[PDB]
From a paper:
The protein is separated into three domains: An N-terminal cytoplasmic GTPase domain (G-domain), a helical domain (together with the G-domain termed ‘NFeoB’), and a C-terminal polytopic membrane-spanning domain. While the import of Fe2+ by FeoB is dependent upon GTP hydrolysis by the G-domain, the mechanism of coupling between the two events is unknown.
Crystals were obtained in space group P212121 with two molecules in the asymmetric unit, and the crystals diffracted to a resolution of 2.5 Å. The transition-state structure shows the canonical G-protein domain fold (residues 1–170) interacting with the helical domain (residues 171–270). Conversion of the GTP substrate to its transition-state causes Switch II, and the adjacent portion of the helical domain, to shift away from the nucleotide binding site. Switch I, however, remains locked its active conformation, capping the nucleotide in the same orientation observed in the mGMPPNP-bound structure.
Numbering used by the authors: 1 to 257
Amino acid sequence: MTEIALIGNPNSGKTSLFNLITGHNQRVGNWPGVTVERKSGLVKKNKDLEIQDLPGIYSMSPYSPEEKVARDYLLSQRADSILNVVDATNLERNLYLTTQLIETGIPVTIALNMIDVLDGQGKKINVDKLSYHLGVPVVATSALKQTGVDQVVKKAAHTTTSTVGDLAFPIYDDRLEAAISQILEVLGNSVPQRSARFYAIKLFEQDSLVEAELDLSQFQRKEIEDIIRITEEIFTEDAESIVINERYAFIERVCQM
Ligand SMILES: Nc1nc2c(ncn2[C@@H]2O[C@H](COP(=O)(O)OP(=O)(O)O)[C@@H](O)[C@H]2O)c(=O)[nH]1
Ligand code: ALF
Ligand SMILES: [K+]
Ligand SMILES: [Mg+2]
């Protein structure tokens, strides 16, 4: 059983796609926060695949307990594949979560949803260019028009932890990359090897939840803290700002193409 997880911002159309894929009639509403818990189902056209509908999430640093459900599912390493549902009308903001999903080490396939609205707004995105610069497969989809749904399930099924070798993580400012490497060595075996980069960046971000979940040694805590301090002076900017800016700068470079 291949495990595919529907991850994306709230109101991106995850349940709409789920319902089409599974034949289900799970709750779909035109406001953020309808889906509040996990729901599994089998892919109608390919019964070997199990797909998970999860609540909308703005980032892997959750604000509400509903956002925690999606995060915990991915970090528990249950999912073989991340089907990242992206709102094409709000691309830049949706990609902020995308950068974090890749970092989890679970291969990401993008469903570039609501392509119909984008067509009605008189705009077009070079799908192949976006896919190449992002390092992940991209299929333009519409849940309304029922466009590209089967194709994106197909690709997600072929982009799992079992079929993908080395992954293409988003590369940031080289000065931050040095800090990430050092934290990766400090971390050693305190985290899964697959998700190591995700945790390393979140520890640099001083994410309270990650810090508590990992329960790192006093020696590890001192060295990370030292790595952050030095990198802050190099960047002449606070740790949270460095990462936030570096994600959006990466997003900027990808979108212009
Ligand atoms: N126009 C258009 N609307 C969509 C599309 N996908 C979903 N929707 C609509 O987007 C809203 C959000 O749907 P939903 O599945 O609840 O989003 P979710 O919170 O990610 O599960 C609903 O009003 C759907 O009718 C799409 O591809 N095109
Ligand atoms: F905002 Al939702 F499922 F209702 F992501
Ligand atoms: K919704
Ligand atoms: Mg939903």
